[PDB]
Design a protein around this ligand. Structure first.
Ligand SMILES: [Mg+2]
Ligand SMILES: [Zn+2]
Lengths: 1341, 51, 50, 253, 149
DNA sequence: GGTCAGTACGTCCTATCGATCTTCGGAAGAGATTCAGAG
RNA sequence: UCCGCGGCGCG
DNA sequence: CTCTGAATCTCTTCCGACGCGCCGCGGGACGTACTGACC
């Protein structure tokens, strides 16, 4: 059943697939991460507790003192979020950490304590996250973007033969720790295995094996399999495993137990192996030539002489065989090498290895890591131990250990964070196996190999860096301090931690200025995933494979919403239902299929898990008890989709929109438009500017409510009740009795944001959407924010659109707009600009804010007050003075004759220069707020005192009003309790409220409730007192301005900007355009009823662009309007409620097998009338992303509205009254204003400032600079014969000083002649070349 | 500074036709090298040329 | 199998996105390559005049 | 000079300071008859400092400032896309230039373009000043500037007089071929968007989905005549690449 | 024993005792820096150009007062003898002699602690109207001797 | 001799290499090492 | 006023 | 069996489209004492 709030305006849904899983809170990825960072963890696995346990306890060098950690606490912020934004400070909480310093006795045992001290050390500020997932760092609101980075672990990759001739596939293994040095193994084209650390100089791999105290014999035993030979009389025998003969050419006869069978030159067939196995042939007899050439496994020493006959890894030869035979080596061991399955790589690497002992290997790696210095045994050992085997400098995280064990098929998923010898051995073995032919290379772009690192993790890392710096300082001070005459606070300096955290939150690449055009921009910025950042990739070095869409992105990363330009594919958007695993991997939900029945049970699967199962598509039909209607169901399985039986299906998609992101989900008829235009539309929705009045989209997707509510732009009721007070700035709700806590006033107050500046200089304004006495439930939208209409996202306006060419004004994506659009202010938007005037201390005098501006007429001064600051509400235009400021000119000493001349000239004989703040040229607006910031110690001006008094009065009024409302609620509670027992209603009305509080009661628990509420009333009074005092002292206190700044005056200008040619408008289907003409109403095409069209769009864009979704919308919107029209007329005729109810019910039931099922028979007559009034303009329609309205349904809805089924009507030209020869598609499309306004783009310059060194015009509109005539433009002029134009652009208009002065003078004199000279940049070049010791000169001057 | 990277008597005056110490401050003293500080009276553009 | 007047399935749309993004990235790199070639050609041929 | 009393310094100043410090230290050591090892180390450091000043990063790790970025040396000033040759000499920023978003002028003749009135006023300011002083309306240049700032009617009449047959160059980036810059006679229009003839869009590769175009004003007589005779759109009806027409009917046409 | 070592910051001197990490530094024209003492904060002395509080520091330049937020405030001034006598207890054992120095000159003007670089020693001098009064007292063999400069 | 201006030295602050950001692809040139032919 | 870096966007 | 030249391999360096707009952050400076020159 629909709620009271929802019954206001029910959007007709056309979806058919039942919704099993509700859309998750769209900002969970940020809030959950930061909550893990800050919240207490008794197990010490997450966040600050984990970092503290990682660093503490701290002990001195062999000392008898220790510093240990007890608990941490985040204090209350000094300023709230709004105060931080106003004052330009960070919204942070102080971190209080309880620490204990313990000093032991010098006598043994070491644990004999002798004194203990405890105190709460303060160790910096932690920026807290706002309720909407943002950070306020310097008043600016910022978002920390999540990072998609390579997971820690081990990855096996190949070059695909690109690096060498003939395409020999070279294989590499790479170990990526969370923190520490990298370790790579790689194969050379000669099959030799090499190792590198931190991608430094290549070294033989066995060196590391030798550095781990493994001898050559031990290395060979680890990596190879051994073959045994015996020598008896003149016979040589080999111990044979038959499988080893596979693939070997039978170059000699083989005999065993008096049986011989060999075809010389043939390969040992599988039949031969089976015959050998069944005959149990354990030994064979082989010639000397066969055993010659094998590699010796272990060193053999002549026991008689002690001389090493043959070392390990040596190749056997006939003479060596004779020597070992005559020595008496009856048993010989060699290593087995097959050119296909068991390569000799380790042995060959040992041959190439230039080391021979552990010390030699350590020296080699020490020289590689620290070149240019002599080695040392202790230093080499320390370096090798610290590289991979020290927790202090190497950390292969828990996720890293899990991935490392999974890649090596180890059972355990938990283990030590540092590498063991077995780990390195196993990685090398796996690489050798991949080289041999068993196993496959890893897919780097696989989402099971990429990992999500969010705000909390990065903040914890930076806090840990700061804390290890603090730990080093603490160890130093503890070792070299007066142990008993101090306290723990004396040992900890908070500067490193604060510095690290502040640097992360201010300067990090992932700490981004929040884009705040509209709520969708905020949501999509907070759900953004970046492959860049620290520990990530770089734009110019990332290849196409990283950017490309991967099959594992299904349900996790949107394939459409990536931006264009250099960031394509590197910036992704989290899908609607996608969340993050415990280990940081993206998961998507699926419905379990049990015995052919789809179950409501939901399992979140990762990419690796998803690959194993067979997953049905969301559009597969199933009815009644869930069963696939079709025997064959489409599924994707291991990245290769096909049809499967019902029984083979393991999971099904939870929703038809789980692949797209939020922005792509908001696009209607996405399945009918190309991915390019869908991408463009999703990107352009984020650039829409809120308009003067919000307008719901007639054709929506049903996601508007979620985007508007999850984004905190709307005031959402946290408890149900009845609204007690409404105005433009405040909503006061009386909470329901069954919903308020004991001892509570039972009243909620919501304060609305009115006309504040967004990050993009747009307007943030909240407007009530409720009226007095209206019921309110939990979750109801109480006030609409920017781009929100009744809790639905409203990015643009519904516009009547005709698709026809119109006299070339739609020639190339251009848009022709009716003047009725401008008259109705439908795309008018409010822009707020903050302009700051800064008074600074300067040499020879400070700058003064005053109205006595020299050489300025009284007319310009009239707009200012007595303090020199413009009045609030003043309408101002370009060039007018907002804040009057003056600056000492310097001495500027004048001779008495010069002084007399200046006096004769006028008021020029002044030592003061104008530096006042003026409105930027072209900006015309109104002054809506003035804020004065004054350094402590500087006297406040009259305007500052007036603003301070106004703020104090406002604070007192607001606190008093809140106290009065809370007291009213508390006394209402008093009255209710007294009515519930011991009622004296007439006497109670006679008695005053203080007497009510003083009244007694019967001996019941209601007396206890009365006592609790009286105590709460006293607490309210005391809280009012303390809050008043605190707010007064905060208003009075000075501002921590930048050094050298005396006072800052900030003026806020509101500008309402009307739609004009040059402005960019777009729909949601990639259909961009720039307005070309604002056409008079009587010139627009009109229908038989005389209704003109609002916008004319060119039909030619649709076929080439293939964004057919805009056509369908244009049809459906027309139907959406038509129904509304039939309601509107029915409302104008004052028809009975019955007919209205029947028509609206028919409209809601029109769909074919729709899941909505609205039933108006349960609505009251007043509710039906309210709904119809809300439906008067149009019937809002929800068409989900891939489960939208079919074409036949659109035709039927048009038929209900008495509109043509084809969607085309006969139009007449208003200029002539003549019918257009063909019917024209006229409907309604949702259009946006894309923040690319022409008045921000137009710029012109004749002469201005020039750069200091290049002596060329400045760049940029803000600097009033000139356009760049680049090298391609010079080429264009050279292709013509335009030598004089090119010369004047190179010489006079850019760099020649005398040339430009003379050209200006000649143009004023009417002579258009040029006197070119040498460009100054060439002189700069000559001087720079001469500064390099190169004599460059001009000849024959 | 007296002999630094921005020295006036090596590279030229900071302000046009004005000596560093201010003894000479007009075009009538053009070309005069001040005895007190050794800065030639000329245009500031020489600081753009003189190495 | 479906056209744009008909609706593509989720699977079909996901398949098409591969080509879409490949084309966009290819244009991104192609601009730089073509510009470098054009600059080289201009530099080699800039002396030649009738 | 910067705000707050700080001074922005070139990296060359830091390099020169390092070289001077090393040189003075070496000279002092030489005066005091220092041992061979110390003077050898100082000479090596002076050599490294001079190498960093000349071409930083060519040998060893480039010396970095407080921002952990390598300091910019003289070679870096000359080399590269951001060097003098390509950033300042082969291309330049120019006066008498502007830019704005383009729209369709379907009423335009081929040789004319719609130019916003405000852009024209700003771009032709010196011509307007000269014509004001010619007619005696402004005695001095300051009076002319005050008149133009107030935007009097006579100023608009003067502006109409000055743009009558004065071509302007319209350019769209990237300028792939010479048709990327073409000359048009400006017709003054209200609004802030430049109006472009539909037939020249193919040569410009220009659509009206948000394109911005740059406007340049030829000053001298030779420049005006080159614009009229060589660069005007009426002379550019054939493609220099192939000889086929480049000003060709499209879309609705 | 303390030995000379080289690192990223040039040359320094570090003590060989593993239990002691005391480090001094090499300066331009000396064998080694003097034994700089541990900084001593003073919450009771407020800054005048800012809201910070002063902290006493030692070094080759001498003994001075500096703002606790030194990179930001960058406000320094020399201590007065009366100021040191106010917080005599917090001063380390060595510097206590400065508190014993006469606090006022025979003319009654207030004294300030200065560092004579030519002799590398602390003295106390009186100033009137911001100019030195020409009276200074030095520390010679456990007593303070005062006289005209 | 006394006074003013200019010049010189110190403080912020170090001390382990460990901070630190870290890891592309293709083509051309120079130097070093290896193979084949001739003596 | 200069330089640099980072991030985002449009053609 | 050895020596030289040519060929091949390894290491290092250079180049990588143009134009425009917005936001954020950072960037040695200040103080005190001593010495020399001029009056
Ligand atoms: Mg375009
Ligand atoms: Zn002088």
């Amino acid at each position: 059943v629909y709620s009271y709030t929802e019954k206001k305006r029910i959007r007709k849904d056309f979806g058919k697939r039942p919704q099993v899983l509700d859309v998750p809170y769209l900002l969970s990825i940020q809030l959950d991460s930061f909550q893990k960072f800050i919240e207490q963890d008794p197990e010490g696995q997450y966040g600050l507790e984990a970092a503290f346990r990682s660093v503490f306890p701290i002990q001195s060098y062999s000392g008898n003192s220790e510093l240990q950690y007890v608990s941490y606490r985040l204090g209350e912020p000094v300023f709230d979020v709004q105060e931080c934004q106003i004052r330009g400070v960070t919204y942070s909480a102080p971190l209080r950490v309880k620490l204990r310093l313990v000093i032991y006795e010098r006598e043994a045992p070491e644990g004999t304590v002798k004194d203990i001290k405890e105190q709460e050390v303060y160790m910096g500020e932690i920026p807290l996250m706002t309720d909407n997932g943002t950070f306020v760092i310097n008043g600016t609101e910022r978002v920390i973007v999540s990072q998609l980075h390579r997971s820690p672990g081990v990855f096996f990759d190949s070059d695909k033969g690109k690096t060498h001739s003939s395409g020999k596939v070279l294989y590499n293994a790479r170990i990526i720790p969370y923190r520490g040095s990298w370790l790579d193994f790689e194969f050379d084209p000669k099959d030799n295995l090499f190792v590198r650390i931190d991608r430094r100089r290549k070294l033989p791999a066995t060196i590391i094996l030798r550095a781990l105290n493994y001898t050559t014999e031990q290395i060979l035993d680890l990596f190879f399999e051994k073959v045994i030979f015996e020598i008896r009389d003149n016979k040589l025998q080999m111990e044979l495993v038959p499988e080893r003969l596979r693939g070997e050419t039978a170059s000699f006869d083989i005999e065993a137990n008096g049986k011989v069978y060999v075809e010389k030159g043939r390969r040992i067939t599988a039949r031969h192996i089976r015959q050998l196995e069944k005959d149990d042939v354990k030994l064979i007899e082989v010639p000397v030539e066969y055993i010659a050439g094998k590699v010796v496994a272990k060193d053999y020493i002549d026991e008689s002489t002690g001389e090493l006959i043959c070392a390990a890894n040596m190749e056997l030869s006939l003479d060596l065989l004779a020597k070992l035979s005559q020595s008496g080596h009856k048993r010989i061991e060699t290593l087995f090498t097959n050119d296909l399955d068991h390569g000799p790589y380790i042995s060959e690497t040992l041959r190439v290895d230039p080391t021979n002992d552990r010390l030699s290997a350590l020296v080699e790696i020490y020289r590689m890591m620290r070149p240019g210095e002599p080695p040392t045994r202790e230093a080499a050992e320390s370096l090798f131990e610290n590289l991979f085997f020290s927790e202090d400098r190497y950390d292969l995280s828990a996720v890293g250990r899990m991935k490392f064990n999974r890649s090596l098929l180890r059972e355990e998923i938990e283990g030590s964070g540092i590498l063991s010898k077995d780990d390195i051995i196993d990685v090398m073995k796996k690489l050798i196996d991949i080289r041999n032919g068993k196993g496959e290379v890893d897919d780097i772009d696989h989402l099971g190999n990429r990992r999500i690192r969010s705000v909390g993790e990065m903040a914890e890392n930076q806090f840990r860096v700061g804390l290890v710096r603090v730990e080093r300082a603490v160890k130093e001070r503890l070792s070299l301090g007066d142990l008993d005459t101090l306290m723990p606070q004396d040992m900890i300096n908070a500067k490193p931690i604060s510095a690290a955290v502040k640097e992360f939150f201010g300067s990090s690449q992932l700490s981004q200025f929040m884009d705040q055009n509209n709520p969708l921009s905020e949501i999509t910025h907070k759900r953004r995933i970046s492959a860049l950042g620290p520990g990530g990739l770089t734009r110019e070095r990332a290849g196409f494979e990283v950017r490309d869409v991967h099959p594992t992105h299904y349900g996790r990363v949107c394939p459409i919403e990536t931006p264009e330009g250099p960031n394509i594919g590197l910036i992704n958007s989290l899908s609607v239902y996608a969340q993050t695993n415990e280990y940081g991997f993206l998961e998507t939900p699926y419905r379990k299929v049990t015995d052919g029945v789809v179950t409501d049970e939901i399992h979140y699967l990762s990419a690796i898990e998803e690959g194993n199962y067979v997953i049905a598509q969301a559009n597969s039909n199933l009815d009644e008890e869930g069963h696939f209607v079709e025997d064959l169901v489409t599924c994707r399985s291991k990245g290769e989709s096909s049809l499967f039986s019902r029984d083979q299906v393991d999971y099904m998609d939870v929703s038809t929109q789980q692949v797209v992101s939020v922005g792509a989900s908001l696009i209607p008829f996405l399945e009918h438009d190309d991915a390019n235009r869908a991408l463009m539309g999703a990107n352009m929705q984020r650039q829409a500017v809120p308009t003067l009045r919000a307008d719901k989209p007639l054709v929506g997707t049903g996601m508007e409510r979620a985007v508007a509510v999850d984004s905190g732009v709307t005031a959402v009721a946290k408890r149900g009740g009845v609204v007690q007070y409404v105005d433009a700035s405040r909503i006061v709700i009386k909470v329901n009795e069954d919903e308020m806590y004991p001892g509570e006033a039972g009243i909620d107050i919501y304060n609305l944001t009115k006309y504040t500046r967004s990050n993009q200089n747009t307007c943030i304004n909240q407007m009530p959407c409720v009226s007095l006495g209206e019921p309110v439930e939990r979750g109801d939208v109480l006030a609409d924010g920017p781009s929100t209409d009744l809790g639905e996202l409203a990015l643009g306006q519904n516009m009547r659109v005709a698709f026809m060419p119109w006299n070339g004004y739609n020639f190339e994506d251009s848009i022709l707009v009716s003047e009725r659009v401008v008259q109705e202010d439908r795309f008018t938007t409010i822009h707020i600009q903050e302009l700051a005037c800064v008074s600074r201390d300067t040499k020879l005098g400070p700058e003064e804010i005053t109205a006595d501006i020299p050489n300025v007429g009284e007319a310009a001064l009239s707009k200012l007050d007595e303090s020199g600051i413009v009045y609030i509400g003043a309408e101002v235009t370009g060039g007018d003075i907002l804040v009057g400021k003056v600056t000492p000119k310097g001495e500027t000493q004048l001779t008495p004759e010069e002084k007399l001349l200046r006096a004769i000239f006028g008021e020029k004989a002044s030592d003061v220069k104008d530096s006042s703040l003026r409105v930027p040229n072209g900006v015309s607006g109104t002054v809506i707020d003035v804020q004065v910031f004054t350094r402590d110690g500087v006297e406040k001006d009259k305007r500052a005192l007036e603003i301070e008094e106004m703020q104090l009065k406002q604070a007192k009024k607001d606190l008093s009003e809140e106290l009065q409302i809370l007291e009213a609620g508390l006394f209402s509670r008093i009255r209710a309790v007294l009515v519930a027992g011991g009622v004296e209603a007439e006497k109670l009305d006679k008695l005053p409220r203080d007497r009510w509080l003083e009244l007694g009661l019967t001996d019941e628990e209601k007396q206890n409730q009365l006592e609790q509420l009286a105590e709460q009333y006293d607490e309210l009074k005391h809280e009012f007192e303390k809050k008043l005092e605190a707010k007064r002292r905060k208003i009075t206190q000075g501002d921590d301005l930048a050094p050298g700044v005396l006072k800052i005056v900030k003026v806020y200008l509101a500008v309402k900007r009307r739609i004009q040619p040059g402005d960019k408008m777009a729909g949601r289907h990639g259909n961009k355009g720039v307005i070309s003409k604002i056409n008079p109403i009587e010139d627009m095409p009109y229908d038989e009823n005389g209704t003109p069209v609002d916008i004319v769009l060119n039909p030619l864009g649709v076929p080439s662009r293939m964004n057919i979704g805009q056509i369908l919308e244009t049809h459906l919107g027309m139907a959406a309007k038509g129904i509304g029209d039939k309601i509107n007329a029915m409302l104008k005729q004052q028809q009975e409620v019955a007919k209205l109810r029947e028509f609206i019910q028919r409209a809601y039931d029109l769909g074919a097998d729709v899941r909505q099922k609205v039933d108006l028979s349960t609505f009251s007559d007043e509710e039906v009338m309210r709904l119809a009034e809300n439906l008067r303009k149009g019937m809002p329609i929800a068409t989900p992303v891939f489960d939208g309205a079919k074409e036949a349904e659109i035709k039927e809805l048009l038929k209900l509205g008495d509109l043509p089924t084809s969607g085309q009507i006969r139009l007449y030209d208003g200029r002539t009254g003549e019918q257009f020869e063909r019917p024209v598609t006229v409907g309604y499309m949702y259009m946006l204003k894309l923040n690319h306004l022409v008045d921000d783009k137009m710029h012109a310059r004749s002469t201005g400032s020039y750069s200091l060194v290049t002596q060329q015009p400045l760049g940029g509109k803000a600097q009033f600079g000139g356009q760049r005539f680049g090298e391609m433009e010079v080429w264009a002029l050279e292709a013509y014969g335009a030598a004089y134009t090119l010369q004047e652009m190179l010489t006079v208009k850019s760099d020649d000083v005398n040339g430009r002065t003379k050209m200006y003078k000649n143009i004023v004199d009417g002579n258009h002649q040029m006197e070119p000279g040498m460009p100054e940049s060439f002189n700069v070049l000559l001087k720079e070349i001469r500064s390099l010791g190169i004599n460059i000169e001009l000849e024959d001057e | 500074e007296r002999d630094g990277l921005f020295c006036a008597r090596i590279f030229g005056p900071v302000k046009d036709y004005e000596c560093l110490c201010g003894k000479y401050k007009r075009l009538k003293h053009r070309g005069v090298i001040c005895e007190k500080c050794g800065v030639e009276v000329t245009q500031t553009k020489v600081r753009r040329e003189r190495m | 199998t479906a056209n744009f007047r008909e609706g593509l399935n989720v699977l079909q749309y996901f398949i098409s996105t591969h080509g879409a993004r490949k084309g966009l990235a290819d244009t991104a790199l192609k601009t730089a390559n073509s510009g470098y070639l054009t600059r080289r050609l201009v530099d080699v041929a800039q002396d030649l005049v009738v | 000079p910067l705000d707050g009393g700080r001074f922005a310094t070139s990296d060359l100043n830091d390099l020169y300071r390092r070289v001077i410090n090393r040189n003075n230290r070496l000279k002092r050591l030489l005066d005091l008859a220092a041992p061979d090892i110390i003077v050898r180390n100082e000479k090596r450091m002076l050599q490294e400092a001079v190498d960093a000043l000349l071409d930083n990063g060519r040998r060893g790790r480039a010396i970095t400032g407080s921002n952990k970025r390598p300091l910019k040396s003289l070679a870096d000033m000359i080399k590269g896309k951001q060097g003098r040759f390509r950033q300042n000499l082969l291309g330049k920023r120019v006066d008498y230039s502007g830019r704005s978003v383009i729209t369709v002028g379907p009423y335009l003749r081929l040789h004319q373009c719609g130019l916003p009135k405000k852009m024209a006023l700003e771009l032709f300011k010196p011509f307007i000043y000269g014509k004001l002083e010619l007619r005696g309306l402004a005695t001095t240049i300051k009076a002319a500037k005050k008149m133009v700032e107030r935007e009097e009617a006579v100023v608009w009449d003067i502006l109409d007089e000055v743009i009558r047959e004065h071509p302007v160059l319209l350019n769209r980036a990237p300028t792939l071929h010479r048709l990327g810059i073409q000359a048009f006679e400006p017709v003054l229009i209200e609004g802030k968007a430049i109006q472009l003839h539909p037939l020249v869009c193919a040569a410009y590769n220009a659509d009206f989905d948000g394109d911005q175009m740059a406007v340049h004003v030829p000053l001298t007589l030779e420049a005006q005549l080159e614009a009229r005779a060589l660069m005007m759109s009426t002379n550019n009806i054939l493609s220099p690449a192939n000889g086929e027409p480049i000003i060709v009917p499209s879309q609705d046409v | 024993e303390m030995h000379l070592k080289m690192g990223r910051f040039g040359k320094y001197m570090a003590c060989t005792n593993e239990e002691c990490k005391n480090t001094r530094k090499i300066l331009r024209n000396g064998e080694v820096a003097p034994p700089k003492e541990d900084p001593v904060p003073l919450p009771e002395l407020p800054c005048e150009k800012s809201d910070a509080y002063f902290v006493l520091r030692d070094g080759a330049a001498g003994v001075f007062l500096a703002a606790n937020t030194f990179p930001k405030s960058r406000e320094t001034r020399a201590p007065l003898v009366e100021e040191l006598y106010r917080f005599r207890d917090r001063l380390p054992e060595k510097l206590r002699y400065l508190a014993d120095a006469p606090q006022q000159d025979p003319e009654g003007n207030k004294t300030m602690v200065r560092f004579s670089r030519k002799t590398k020693q602390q003295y106390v001098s009186s100033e009137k109207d911001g100019k030195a009064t020409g009276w200074s007292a030095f520390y010679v063999d456990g007593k303070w001797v005062e006289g005209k400069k």
